[PDB]
Amino acid sequence: XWXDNXXXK
Amino acid sequence: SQGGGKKKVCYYYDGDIGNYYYGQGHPMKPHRIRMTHNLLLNYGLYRKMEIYRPHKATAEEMTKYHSDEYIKFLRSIRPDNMSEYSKQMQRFNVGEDCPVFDGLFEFCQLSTGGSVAGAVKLNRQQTDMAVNWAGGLHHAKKSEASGFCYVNDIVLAILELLKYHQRVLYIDIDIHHGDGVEEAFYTTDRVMTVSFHKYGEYFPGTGDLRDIGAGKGKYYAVNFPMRDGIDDESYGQIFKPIISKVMEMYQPSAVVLQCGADSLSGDRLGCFNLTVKGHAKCVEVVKTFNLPLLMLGGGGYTIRNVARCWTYETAVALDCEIPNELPYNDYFEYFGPDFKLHISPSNMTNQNTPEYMEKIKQRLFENLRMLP
Ligand code: NA
Ligand code: NA
Ligand SMILES: [Zn+2]
């Protein structure tokens, strides 16, 4: 959810 | 009875909810709930609804869904003893996206307490609607945290409604997929979960059109995948017909509506192009069916628009028209440079073609036809 770099997040 | 009239609203808020801090740079700001509360007070909306302070939900109330091992970890973990729980932090998905902060468990108690108390107030038929903007944490799983959510207050509040309601309807207009609520009731027909969300290289990566439930819950999970930049007109063209078709086929006796504001235009994490009026249109559509309704919060990370959205949606629930000129409040500078209640959409491209919206809706009606 917060940020990018895989897994969405 | 005919399905109308002004509804009684019970509003849940704890003045300490705005002091919990996720950490520097973290987009989840519980201060937005205090801004929302202070804004609707200066609008005078406290005269039209009953304001309650929620209790702190105990670990016993949370274990009605969550595992004992996961809840006991939430009571124990603190910023001063993270080194001892470094293994348990990874097991329960705590430390990065869902960080450890001071009063973490208390924040979960206040957020959950408002939701379960609203469900009790609805079960006892002492209100028509219950509002808990601190709730709506739709990502929390049975034994792990996710998407800034630690305890899934929605699942606990719906389990409370299932004591007196045979069928409960969950609607999720957060820009992210309501995976936690959908997973909890994926194999039962007593709860139908309807989620509108962005799909494709986006958190949490679930919510495909072809996810309709399993077992006895097959065709009782509805997901509308969307692309970037959807506006009020495209969103309103599909929400009302799909919700109307769900009410006809499923016929619930209670409704839970998660009103995540991160689907608004200009959200720090969202990429939709909705306005407050387009977002609040979903509230008054669900409201027209005159069923016991629990309104919860959720996402929303441009906090000045979050305070706008949930204040207006509270007035919509109260059927009270409030002026676009924002009254003075303790956070008046947050709403510059316009100091208006309603927002305007951006010039971003709506990648949701009208034919795409019509095709996804048509395939969802096929699934709804498989209900008894
Ligand atoms: Na959603
Ligand atoms: Na279900
Ligand atoms: Zn979200």
Residue numbers in the entry:
A (entry chain F): 500 to 508
B (entry chain A): 8 to 379
Structure paper excerpt:
To circumvent this problem, in design round 2, we built up macrocyclic scaffolds de novo inside the protein pocket to increase shape complementarity between the peptide and the HDAC2 pocket, and to make additional favorable interactions between the peptide backbone atoms and HDAC2. We also incorporated a Trp residue as an additional anchor that lays flat on a hydrophobic surface close to the active site, and mimics an aromatic ring observed in the same position in several small molecule inhibitors of HDACs. The macrocycle chain was extended from the SHA-Trp dimer, and the conformational space of closed macrocycles harboring these two residues was explored using generalized kinematic loop closure. The best tested peptide, des2.1.0 had an IC50 value of 49.3 nM, a four-fold improvement over method 1. To improve the affinity of des2.1.0, we mutated a D-Lys7 residue adjacent to a hydrophobic pocket in des2.1.0 to D-Met. The new des2.1.1 had an improved IC50 value of 16 nM for HDAC2. The crystal structure of des2.1.1 matches the designed orientation for the two anchor residues, SHA and Trp, with the position of the water molecules retained. While the electron density map for SHA and Trp are well resolved and match the designed model, the rest of the molecule appears to be in a conformation different from the solution structure obtained by NMR and the designed model; however, the electron density is too weak or absent, and the thermal B-factors are too high, for those residues to enable a meaningful comparison. This flexibility is consistent with the observation of multiple states during conformational sampling.
To address this challenge, we develop a computational “anchor extension” methodology for targeting protein interfaces by extending a peptide chain around a non-canonical amino acid residue anchor. To test our approach using a well characterized model system, we design cyclic peptides that inhibit histone deacetylases 2 and 6 (HDAC2 and HDAC6) with enhanced potency compared to the original anchor (IC50 values of 9.1 and 4.4 nM for the best binders compared to 5.4 and 0.6 µM for the anchor, respectively). SHA can coordinate to the zinc ion in the active site of HDACs. In all the crystal structures we obtained, the thiol functional group of SHA coordinates the catalytic Zn2+ ion with a Zn2+– S separation of 2.3 Å in a distorted tetrahedral geometry reminiscent of that observed for the inhibitor Largazole.
